[PDB]
Amino acid sequence: ENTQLSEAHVEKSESCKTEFASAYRAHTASASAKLRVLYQGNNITVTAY
Amino acid sequence: NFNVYKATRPYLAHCPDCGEGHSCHSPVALERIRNEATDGTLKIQVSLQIGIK
Amino acid sequence: KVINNCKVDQCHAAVTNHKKWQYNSPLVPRNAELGDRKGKIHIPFPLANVTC
Amino acid sequence: EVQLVESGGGLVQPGRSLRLSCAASGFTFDDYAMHWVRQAPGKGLEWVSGISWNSGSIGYADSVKGRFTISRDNAKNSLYLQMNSLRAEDTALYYCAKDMGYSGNDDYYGMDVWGQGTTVTVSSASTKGPSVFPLAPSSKSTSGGTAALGCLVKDYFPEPVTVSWNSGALTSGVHTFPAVLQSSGLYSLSSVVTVPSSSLGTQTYICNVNHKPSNTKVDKRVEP
């Protein structure tokens, strides 16, 4: 009449705060660009969407 | 610090290989090996208590 | 304590009075459905972000 | 924050049923087995009944085995005890207590949390109010031994009778006794105060008897 009770469970590791992979859903994208223009012979930087 | 170990003790546990190719109860039995780090560093948990008299 | 009647090969004995607690390792039997004299030890050496 | 709150109780006649219950708070109800324990006046603790987690096992004391039923409502975090065919022998304080596990088959545990027990009295009697009588000092023979004067409160049914002197003004040298149940089913208690014998003819002493259940207050003057 000698019996043993065994149990186990799974939980997220503490390291999951640093080492993990993220699963994302992508939808649409917004383009933007950095343009150089030689305006009046000068080099000017234009940044815009 | 080590104040948390004031009420604790060392313990014996079973070891599958005590170095002779045979199993026995041993003061140096391992509990777990952790390798979460990617730089190759290992973190080993043992029954021994180090730094405490 | 001398029993005075039985043989040493007939009887069992163990130490029951302990003052210090130990990690509840999977290789050590539980003495109750839920362990008693519960305490906590923090684990040193946390994981961190570094450059190799 | 962990506590058990008793509810129910009061005066019931013999042969009638009474329902008791307890509310659990500060802990998870579904993680522990629950027990009922009762204590009669002048007696130690007596175990009455107990219920295991998920009602896996039910136990009763032999004296109530065919009369008491135990149940629990996990959704409401509450414990219930149904007492049928109550007898005079069942008069006691009834406490709820929480176990240290889900099973009662573990002998390594005791009862760690206890509530505030309620009073259950089983008797075929009405809430009769007290009669009050003075107990005059024997000043003729005790004058050199310091004077003792008192009062007697007799023939009342309800337990909680409060007696004080001089409307609480007299607290020193005051001795009161626990009430004793009489064969009539009624209780009686005495109260005495010790004073200088020379003050008997100068100071009036009043025995103030307060009986809440009957909304009755009696002020009795005690003299030589």
Ligand SMILES: *[C@@H]1O[C@H](CO[C@@H]2O[C@@H](C)[C@@H](O)[C@@H](O)[C@@H]2O)[C@@H](O[C@H]2O[C@H](CO)[C@@H](O)[C@H](O)[C@H]2NC(C)=O)[C@H](O)[C@H]1NC(C)=O
């Ligand atoms: C206005 O722009 C001329 C082009 O600019 C070069 O390329 C850009 C993308 C940026 O990297 C900038 O830093 C570079 O200088 C530039 O004249 C230069 O052009 C050549 C390359 O075509 C460059 O190697 C050289 O250093 C320059 N030559 C010149 C001075 O004629 C300069 O910034 C400027 N020129 C004018 C019109 O002022």
